[PDB]
Structure formats: structure tokens, C-alpha cells
Design an enzyme around this catalytic site. Structure first.
Site, PDB file in Angstrom:
ATOM      1  N   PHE A  65       0.857  -1.195   0.000  1.00  0.00           N
ATOM      2  CA  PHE A  65       0.000   0.000   0.000  1.00  0.00           C
ATOM      3  C   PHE A  65       0.874   1.219   0.000  1.00  0.00           C
ATOM      4  CE2 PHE A  65       0.950  -1.189   4.368  1.00  0.00           C
ATOM      5  CZ  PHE A  65       1.365  -0.009   4.938  1.00  0.00           C
ATOM      6  N   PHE A 115       3.079   3.250   0.653  1.00  0.00           N
ATOM      7  CA  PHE A 115       4.317   3.583   1.330  1.00  0.00           C
ATOM      8  C   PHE A 115       4.594   2.626   2.459  1.00  0.00           C
ATOM      9  CE2 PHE A 115       3.925   6.584  -1.765  1.00  0.00           C
ATOM     10  CZ  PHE A 115       3.143   7.711  -1.481  1.00  0.00           C
TER      11      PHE A 115
END
Ligand code: HAS
Ligand code: HEM
Ligand code: CUA
Lengths: 33, 552, 166
Positions: free
Chosen positions: C84, C86
Site C-alpha cells: 500500500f 508507502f
């Protein structure tokens, strides 16, 4: 005149350089296996 | 010059437009090279240009301008103007000038968003990364132009075929024909990817696009698109270098066969970009793999045809023993020097691509800095150098402005630097890739994240300085050629420097067969229905569109 | 001369061809070699296995991260991973050593990369679809996950951690 030994070198530098690259990685491949 | 060959003008606009593009796109290079050598010069660049907001907005312009705007424009120049001059015919000018304005208006339309930070999506624009509608609309129009470029050349070929029934397609034409045809087949993926998804997506007409289908359809084009970058160079390398080199194209047939094979195997090979994808069958990937090793044959062929030609050109100008012939060549000559250097680096470039091809091995280097390593040797070395050198014969031929002693020396300057810099950078990126360093990353904003990659970083940075000079020197070189009020008409009408061909009796039978272009084209089409049809039908049955994201 | 030199060119053009073909075929033989062994695991599954990106982390095998690992076979463990914007979940990923690990990966936003440093695991992650890969960890400790598909401004900064327990 005669046999293109110059071209025959180039296709030989090419052939040497393909193998190095390919086997160089195939080796790494199994090592990260 | 302009009024019994106004093609010269329309051709010249494709060059300027393209070379102003390569210049702007390129500015970001030196930065990204240091960025890969762990130095952040982006505050420096942000202070040169107030509009840049991120490494990635800069990498996007760089991808897009250089590899998409530059190369297509070069293609358009070369693969239209050359065939016209060989045939001694004019293209439909109405149509030709429509292609220009479409490449200009698409360019502009796209830029506004790009330069405003609404399309920081890279030159691949993978969904759900959702850019501004004018960037999709802009690129589509930009591509579509090439469709007129296909038509125009097909027309010229229809025309010459008629004045000459039974006769064999002349070589450059033969090449331009299979080229544009192959490019029409290529472009079907991207156009469908645009027309069926991207354009509605950003127009607000749907809320979602399938990531797998989008990339599958995009890679139908994104491979042959690279051949669409290379051939305009191969075209020059085959039919004009050997003249500049002081000799002859050793084989007319081999050069056709080379290109034939490109027409056949350029398009059905895209899952080489998707080895790392889900939802695509292992069987198909391997199939796409074999075919890719196959598309490498033309180039292996090309290596030999071309080498021989230079050996014979160097033989002609008194070249000695095992290597003597290399010295005897016209090393004083930017037109000669630029692609021959590109060709030296094309060696490694290729030897990488074949590792890349071989399915299981692509899990060692995929999305590392090794793909950059690879493709720079290919498109930013060989294509670009062939491009660069070519101003030294093509530009005089368009405008009638001769090249002085010093502007030549300024060019030799540029090309030896560009090449060396490209060599150097390829060590870094390849090396960095093997050390797992990812690509498309602002890695100098995480200084302690690749500590084992200290050394290749040195090379990147070093290539960054060299190549900054390289480019600056080029910009200067280029504009001195373009802004001198130095003019003569007599060398502007002086013919393109086409090489004579060695041609045997056995040619006849072989060359006649390869001229069966409708047939060969049909096969290429079938090759793509076979290689993508099964997989596409599957995807189109089970479509999972997902919403768009803006993450910059 | 001149015609005398076209003949002997073409022969070696054929000859160079002959060779390069064989050589290229051996590659093809060595590749389908890697395909017949365990290392073939890292090839994503072909079978389409569709999910919804806007629900993946509230319901199902990706919602609670402490559910991630499941004994799915006698020496086989499935690990449900979420890549997702980062990061990765769970962070870290904890898997036992010598075991076959069947990674099932997906994304709730845009495409990410799943590149496990030190290994051949290098699979693209796509919203809406599930990347199935398998791998047996041979050497223990921390491995670092790298997102190697540009994902937005925090791309350069998206790392995970595999923890392979001896
Ligand atoms: C225009 C530039 C392009 C060329 C040309 C090119 C060549 C190949 N590539 Fe590549 N490539 C791949 C496979 C190949 C193969 C099989 C070839 C072949 O066409 C190579 C043929 C070349 C040769 C067989 C060498 C012939 C050498 C010659 C002709 C020079 C000899 C010199 C002489 C004779 C002169 C001597 C004279 C004297 C005087 C000494 C694959 C996988 O199969 C990937 C995916 C990797 C990944 O995971 O993304 C990939 C990645 C890329 C990407 C990244 C796209 C992205 O951003 O995701 C780009 C842009 C690119 C461009 C180019 N690539 N490539
Ligand atoms: C001044 C010489 C150049 C330098 C120093 C340079 C530098 C770079 C670097 C370091 C990268 C990798 C950056 C990253 O992965 O984050 C890159 C990417 C790239 N370069 Fe160049 N570049 C130059 C010229 C060119 C030219 C002329 C072209 C096209 C003909 C080109 C095509 C590309 C493409 C297509 C990418 C991939 C970007 C993406 O992933 O979207 N480069 N450049
Ligand atoms: Cu997620 Cu790069």
C-alpha cells in the site's frame, strides 16, 4: 579479396559479451534461489 | 530546395520540434544520474526551474520528451523523407502537414498538464495512477499522427509500384514500408488502451480501469515501440553510414531480411515486460520469451552485415591486417563517428536485453537500475547518437547550410563525450541493478539506504558531470548550425549520400519473395492474434476495474 | 572481385546464423530447466484471482495483519501481504525457515513492487488482483522488501521486512 576477419572479430566480441552477461546472471539467479 | 522539394521543409520541422524536445527532456538526465550517485541536486534544479515540484515530475518529462516525443519525430523525419528522396517522389503535402500539426498540438496539449503537475505518472502511465485528461488526449493525438505517417508512405509506395509494375520495391522504401506497417500493428494496443479505457477514464465517463488489461494492452505497443525507435537508425546505418564510411552496403537482401523479421516478430513479444505479472499464464510467458530471443536474430544479422561493410569500407581506404581497417576509417567525421560509437555500446546493450528476455533471469534485474543501464545503451546511445551525427549530412541537405571546420570539431567533441558518458552511466546502473537498487526512485533522499552500492554511485555521479557538459556542448553545437545566416542552395539540392549496394545473382529469388508484403503483413497480424488473443479474451471476460489515484 | 566477395559474405551470414540459433536454443533449454525445478515458484500463478481494492483491508484475509500467516500444508505456509501507499503489512512479515512460503499479495491503491532483496521474489502487485508466489528461505534473518514500481512521492521510501525464523 578475402574473408571478413574484422566482422568475425566483431561477431566474436558480441558472442563473448552475450555469454558473460547471460551466464553472469544465470549464476546470480541460482544464488538467489 | 523548398519548392520542388517542400518535403525538405516539412521534414525539417519534425527535426527541430524533435530536437527541442530531446534538449528539454535531457536537462533532467544529469540530475537523475547524480541522484543515482547519491547526490541531491534537485534543490539546485528547483532553483533553475520554479515549476518542478519533484524528482518524479522531472523523470516524467524526461521519459516522455526524450523517448516518446523525440524518437517518434525522428522516425517521422527519417522514415518518410528518406524513402521520398530515393524514389524521387513527393508525399501528399496536405497529409504531411496534417501530421506535423498533430504532433505539435498533441505535444502542446500534453505539456500544459505535465508542466503543471497534473500528470506525474511516468511515460508508462500505469493505471490507477490517474493523470489529467489533456495528457491522455494530448498523447493519443501525438501518436495518431504516426497513422498519417504510415498512410503517406504507403501512398508513395502505391504510386511507385504503379509507375513500375513487376519491379522490386527499392531498398529504403522496402524498409520504410515494412516499418510503417509493423508500427500500425504495434500501435493497436496503445490506441485500444487509450480509446477503450484511458480517455473515458480521465474524461470522467467511468470511475475505473483494469490494471492488468491496461498493462497488457500497453505492452503490446511498448515493445514494438522500441523497434519503432531503432529502425530509423538501422535504416541510416544500413543505407547511408556505409557511404559516409567510404564503402558499400555488402548485402541488399540481408538488410531487407533483417527488416522483414522485424515486421514479423516485433509485436507478439510483450509479456517480456510482464514476466512479473499475475494473471498471465506461465506457458504464455515462455512462449513470449522464445519469440523475444527470436526478434534478436535480425540484430545479430545486422551486426554482421554492418561490420563487414565497415571492414570493406576500411579495406577500401587502405586498411591493414586484423584491425588495421578500423584506423583507416574517417574518424574525423561526426556523421561517421556518432553511430559507430553507438554501435559499440549497442553490443553490451543487446547482451543485457537477452538476459532481460529469458523469463526466469528477469527476476534478477526487473525494475532495478539495470533496465535503465540496458535501455540507455540502446535509445540514448545508439538511436540518439545516430540522430546526433546525422545533422552533419541531413541538415545541410535540408537547408543548404554547410558545416564549417569548427562546428564539425564541436560535434566530434559532443559525440565522444556523450558516448563515453553513456558507457560510464551503464556501468553504474547495471552494477547498481545487480546490487538490487531499484529504478524510478529518488534514492538520494534516502542516503543510507544503499550503502553497499558506494562505488557504482561514483560512476553515476561522474557520468552526470560528463553528460552535463556533453549536452551543453550539444545545445551550443546544434544552434550554431541552425542560426548561422550561412546559406548556399547548390548543396541543399546536392543528393542524399546513399551507399551503393553489393548485389549478387541469388538476390532475385530471395528478394522477390520478401516483396510479397501483403502476405508477410497478414502473417504478422496472425502472429499477434495467436500470441495475444487467448490471453486477452481471458482478461476481457473477467474485468476488474479499480478507482484512480493521485499520489503526487 | 566485388561479386567474388558477395558470395563468401553470404555463406558466413548463413554460418553465423546457424550458430546463433543453436546458441539461442541452448538458452531456451536452460530456461525451461529453471522452470522444471523449485526456483520455478517465483513465477506468479497464471490463474486470475480477483479481489476488491476498496475492501481488502476491512474484510477478508488482509484485514487483520495478525492473521497474515497460516499453516496451509505440512511444510507450507501462506502469507497474505498488503502492499500500500508507502508500506507493507504485516511489518515485519514473519515466516519460518526451510518452509515453502506461498506469498499472496495485493494492493488497495496503485501498483507496487514486491522485490525481496537477496532473493528471486520480484513480483508486481496490482490493485484488484492477487500475486501468488512461492519460495523457500534457505538462509535466516532479516530480508528487506523494496517497492520497485514507482507508486507516488513516497516511492523511494517504501520498504518492508521479511523475518525468516530458524
Ligand atoms: C530503443 C531502445 C531499445 C532496444 C533497441 C532494445 C533491445 C532489446 N531489449 Fe530492451 N528490454 C528487453 C529485451 C530486449 C531485447 C530482447 C532486445 C533486442 O532487440 C537486442 C538486440 C541486439 C543485439 C543482438 C546486439 C547487436 C549489436 C550490434 C548490431 C552492434 C555491433 C557493432 C558493430 C558491428 C560495430 C563494430 C564497428 C567497429 C568499427 C568496431 C526486455 C525483456 O525482454 C526488457 C524488460 C526488462 C524489465 O524487466 O523491464 C527490456 C527493457 C527495455 C526498456 C524499459 C521499458 C520500461 O520503462 O519499462 C526500454 C525503454 C528498452 C529499449 C530497447 N531495448 N528495453
Ligand atoms: C543527458 C543524458 C541523460 C542522462 C544523464 C539521463 C539520465 C537518466 C537516469 C539516471 C535515468 C534513471 C532514473 C530513474 O530510474 O529514476 C533515466 C531514465 C530514463 N531515460 Fe534518460 N537520461 C539521459 C538522456 C536520455 C535520452 C536522450 C532518452 C531518450 C531517447 C532517455 C530515456 C530515458 C527513459 C525512457 C527513462 C525511464 C524513465 C521512466 O522510468 O519513466 N534518457 N535517465
Ligand atoms: Cu510502492 Cu514504489
Amino acid at each position: 579479396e578475402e574473408k571478413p576477419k574484422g566482422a568475425l572479430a566483431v561477431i566474436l566480441v558480441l558472442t563473448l559479451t552475450i555469454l558473460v552477461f547471460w551466464l553472469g546472471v544465470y549464476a546470480v539467479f541460482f544464488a538467489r534461489g | 530546395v523548398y519548392e520542388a522539394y517542400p518535403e525538405k521543409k516539412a521534414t525539417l520541422y519534425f527535426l527541430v520540434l524533435g530536437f527541442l524536445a530531446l534538449i528539454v527532456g535531457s536537462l533532467f538526465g544529469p540530475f537523475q544520474a547524480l541522484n543515482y550517485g547519491n547526490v541531491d541536486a534537485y534543490p539546485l534544479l528547483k532553483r533553475l526551474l520554479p515549476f518542478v515540484q519533484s524528482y518524479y515530475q522531472g523523470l516524467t518529462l524526461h521519459g516522455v520528451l526524450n523517448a516518446i516525443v523525440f524518437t517518434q519525430l525522428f522516425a517521422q523525419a527519417i522514415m518518410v523523407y528518406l524513402p521520398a528522396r530515393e524514389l524521387n517522389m513527393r508525399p501528399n503535402m496536405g497529409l504531411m502537414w496534417l501530421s506535423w500539426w498533430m504532433a505539435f498540438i498533441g505535444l502542446v496539449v500534453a505539456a500544459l498538464p505535465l508542466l503543471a503537475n497534473e500528470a506525474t505518472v511516468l511515460y508508462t502511465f500505469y493505471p490507477p495512477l490517474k493523470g489529467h485528461w489533456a495528457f491522455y488526449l494530448g498523447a493519443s493525438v501525438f501518436v495518431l499522427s504516426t497513422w498519417v505517417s504510415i498512410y503517406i508512405v504507403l501512398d508513395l509506395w502505391r504510386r511507385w509500384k504503379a509507375a513500375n509494375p513487376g519491379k522490386v520495391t527499392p531498398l529504403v522504401t522496402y524498409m520504410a514500408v515494412v516499418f510503417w506497417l509493423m508500427w500500425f500493428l504495434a500501435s493497436l494496443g496503445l490506441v485500444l488502451e487509450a480509446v477503450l479505457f484511458l480517455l473515458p477514464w480521465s474524461f470522467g465517463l467511468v470511475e475505473g480501469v483494469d490494471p492488468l488489461v491496461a498493462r497488457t494492452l500497453f505492452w503490446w505497443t511498448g515493445h514494438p515501440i522500441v523497434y519503432f525507435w531503432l529502425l530509423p537508425a538501422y535504416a541510416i546505418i544500413y543505407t547511408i553510414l556505409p557511404k559516409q564510411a567510404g564503402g558499400k552496403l555488402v548485402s541488399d537482401p540481408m538488410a531487407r531480411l533483417a527488416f522483414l523479421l522485424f515486421l514479423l516478430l516485433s509485436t507478439p513479444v510483450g509479456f517480456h515486460h510482464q514476466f512479473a505479472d499475475p494473471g498471465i499464464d506461465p506457458t504464455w510467458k515462455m512462449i513470449h520469451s522464445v519469440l523475444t530471443l527470436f526478434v534478436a536474430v535480425p540484430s545479430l544479422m545486422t551486426a554482421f552485415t554492418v561490420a563487414a561493410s565497415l571492414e570493406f569500407a576500411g579495406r577500401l581506404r587502405g586498411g591493414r591486417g586484423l584491425f588495421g581497417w578500423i584506423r583507416a576509417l574517417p574518424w574525423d567525421n561526426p556523421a561517421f563517428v556518432a553511430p559507430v560509437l553507438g554501435l559499440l555500446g549497442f553490443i553490451p546493450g543487446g547482451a543485457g536485453g537477452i538476459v532481460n528476455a529469458s523469463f526466469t533471469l528477469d527476476y534478477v534485474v526487473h525494475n532495478t537500475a539495470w533496465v535503465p543501464g540496458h535501455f540507455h545503451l540502446q535509445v540514448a546511445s545508439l538511436v540518439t547518437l545516430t540522430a546526433m551525427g546525422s545533422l552533419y549530412w541531413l541538415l545541410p541537405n535540408l537547408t543548404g547550410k554547410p558545416i564549417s571546420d569548427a562546428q564539425r570539431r564541436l560535434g566530434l567533441a559532443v559525440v565522444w563525450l556523450w558516448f563515453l558518458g553513456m558507457m560510464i552511466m551503464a556501468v553504474g546502473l547495471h552494477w547498481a541493478g545487480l546490487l538490487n537498487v531499484p529504478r524510478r526512485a529518488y534514492i538520494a533522499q534516502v542516503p543510507d539506504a544503499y550503502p553497499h552500492a558506494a562505488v557504482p554511485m561514483v560512476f553515476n555521479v561522474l557520468a552526470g558531470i560528463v553528460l552535463l557538459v556533453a549536452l551543453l556542448l550539444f545545445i551550443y553545437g546544434l544552434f550554431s548550425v541552425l542560426l548561422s545566416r550561412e546559406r548556399k542552395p547548390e548543396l541543399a539540392e546536392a543528393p542524399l549520400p546513399f551507399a551503393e549496394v553489393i548485389s549478387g545473382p541469388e538476390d532475385r529469388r530471395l528478394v522477390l519473395a520478401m516483396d510479397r508484403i501483403g502476405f508477410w503483413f497478414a502473417v504478422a497480424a496472425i502472429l499477434v492474434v495467436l500470441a495475444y488473443g487467448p490471453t486477452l479474451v481471458q482478461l476481457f471476460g473477467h474485468l476488474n476495474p479499480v478507482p484512480g489515484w493521485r499520489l503526487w | 572481385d566485388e561479386h567474388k566477395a558477395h558470395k563468401a559474405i553470404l555463406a558466413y551470414e548463413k554460418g553465423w546464423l546457424a550458430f546463433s540459433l543453436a546458441m539461442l536454443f541452448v538458452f531456451i533449454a536452460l530456461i525451461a530447466y529453471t522452470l522444471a525445478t523449485h526456483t520455478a515458484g517465483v513465477i506468479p500463478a497464471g490463474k486470475l484471482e480477483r479481489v476488491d481494492p476498496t475492501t481488502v483491508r476491512q474484510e477478508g484475509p488482509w484485514a487483520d495483519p495478525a492473521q497474515a500467516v497460516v499453516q496451509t500444508g505440512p511444510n507450507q505456509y501462506t502469507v497474505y501481504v498488503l502492499a500500500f501507499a508507502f508500506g507493507y503489512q504485516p511489518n515485519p512479515i514473519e515466516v519460518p525457515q526451510g518452509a515453502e512460503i506461498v506469498f499472496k499479495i495485493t494492493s488497495p491503491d496503485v501498483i507496487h513492487g514486491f522485490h525481496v532483496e537477496g532473493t528471486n521474489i520480484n513480483v508486481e502487485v496490482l490493485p484488484g488482483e492477487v500475486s501468488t508466489v512461492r519460495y523457500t528461505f534457505k538462509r535466516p534473518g532479516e530480508y528487506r522488501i523494496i517497492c520497485n514500481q514507482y507508486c507516488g512521492l513516497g516511492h523511494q521510501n517504501m520498504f518492508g521486512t521479511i523475518v525468516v525464523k530458524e
